[PDB]
């Protein structure tokens, strides 16, 4: 509990950045008029008519902060290599996170606030089940930024081999393609492909 749960919640909040961008694009009632009589209505009613873009904006900065922490987990260590024995690509497990969990949110109508409370409860419930679901490495935001999620079986030079690890990486991997680890949990590590 706590720290491992907080790391997985951070990965989940990173997984939802494209949803917050889509909601901000979708239901922002910004008066985008270049006309001369389009004066400022005022900051108060501009805030009150754009409540869910403001909330999704705050959640977007939270996703940016958790991406910063995921880069901080690879800043410090990561000067040791392993050998890969069985590489199988699993980037599509990222994309099924999109088209089933982020795509049907935009079909909803974010007008009445009771429906928005229902959709926020749906986000919270999907998050609670998604922490312990063993497929928490699924990511639209990470797979957007060049990262590929592979299922590897690394082999250490001195300790031995470990089975069923998940490698987030920047370049393509294969068998005998030595990488540097920056282990996040006991399941997910960031590879770097020592040439």
């Amino acid at each position: 509990m706590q720290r491992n749960t907080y790391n997985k919640v951070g990965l989940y909040i990173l997984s939802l950045a494209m949803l917050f961008v889509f909601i901000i694009i979708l239901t922002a009632k910004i008066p985008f008029c270049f006309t001369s009589d389009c004066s400022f209505i005022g900051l108060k009613k501009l805030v009150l008519t754009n409540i869910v873009p403001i909330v999704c904006f705050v959640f977007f900065l939270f996703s940016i902060y958790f991406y910063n922490r995921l880069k901080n987990i690879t800043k410090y260590n990561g000067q040791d290599s392993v050998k890969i024995t069985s590489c199988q690509s699993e980037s599509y497990e990222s994309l099924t996170f999109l088209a089933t969990y982020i795509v049907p949110f935009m079909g909803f109508s974010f007008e009445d606030m009771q429906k928005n409370i229902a959709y926020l409860l749906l986000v919270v419930v999907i998050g609670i089940i998604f922490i312990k679901t063993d497929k928490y490495y699924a990511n639209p935001t990470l797979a957007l930024f060049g990262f590929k999620l592979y299922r590897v079986n690394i082999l250490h030079p001195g300790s031995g081999e470990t089975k069923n690890l998940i490698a987030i990486s920047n370049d393509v991997l294969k068998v005998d393609d030595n990488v540097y680890y920056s282990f996040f949990d006991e399941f997910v590590f960031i590879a770097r492909k020592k040439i």
């Binding site: 800043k75 410090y76 260590n77 990561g78 000067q79 040791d80 290599s81 392993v82 690394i154 250490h156 030079p157 001195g158 300790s159 031995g160 470990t162 690890l165 030595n178 540097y180 680890y181 282990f183 949990d185 006991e186 399941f187 590590f189 020592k194």
Partner: protein, 315 residues
Amino acid sequence: MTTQQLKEKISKIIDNFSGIRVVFTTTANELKLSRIEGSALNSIAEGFIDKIKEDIINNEDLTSPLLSNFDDRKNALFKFDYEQYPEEFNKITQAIAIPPNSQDYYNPLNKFTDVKGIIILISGDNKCLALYKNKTNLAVLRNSRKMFNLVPDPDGYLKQLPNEILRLDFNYDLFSIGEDFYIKNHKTLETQMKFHQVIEAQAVIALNSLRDSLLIEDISGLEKSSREISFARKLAKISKHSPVLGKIDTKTIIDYVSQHKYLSAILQINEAGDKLLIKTKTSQKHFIKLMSDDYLQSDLTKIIYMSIAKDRLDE
């Protein structure tokens, strides 16, 4: 008996270098991995590779005798041939086989007071060599002064500010390759990890063998001198590799101290001509050095020398 095996192993380790990991050992005898910054870890890897190149790879005068054959020579890695492994060696061999997905990372809120030794796991070509170091109480590194009121502070007030920074120098005290241990600094053995009990037991066995050999008359001065570990180590080397104790008789030893130029002056014979009169500390250390065959004579020049360090050839 040679050094070419370790030289080839270290050539394969360094020339096919893969990675480095820093593992702290703790006073409660468990291992915690560390959180070294990557650029500083690259500097540490480069410096340790350079030191192990300047001491093993580029070195030509490197000899690897046995730890039981302790002599006072430099550039010598002592092979651990003793039958008992201490606790930190078992912890090193545990630290080699730590799986890489382990999550028992060290807590820097402990302020580096519980860490006893630093293990460095330099890896290359599917093998892992483990260097070891002792945190030498910060070796009291003084620091400069950055006074709060201004950034350059042109006033010399240099004091050690934090008292909790880790030293981590570039001198290693012992290391392990494969299933073998090599030892550089024996003060780390004696003081930190308490190796002197086995040496004192071997000195006790040496005193028992010296009583049974009936070469000395009074052994109480030697039993008093056996308390010092600097004497107990050479009594242990007498107990293991004395080439004249038990293989040749006592009478030729009495003759050899009789008609010697130096040894007749200090190492005295008794009135019965069968036991030696060795009471003083100079006579004691001369007795010890004669057991190690250090009064050693030339052939081309025919000059007797005091051989502090010697070996039985076979290169």
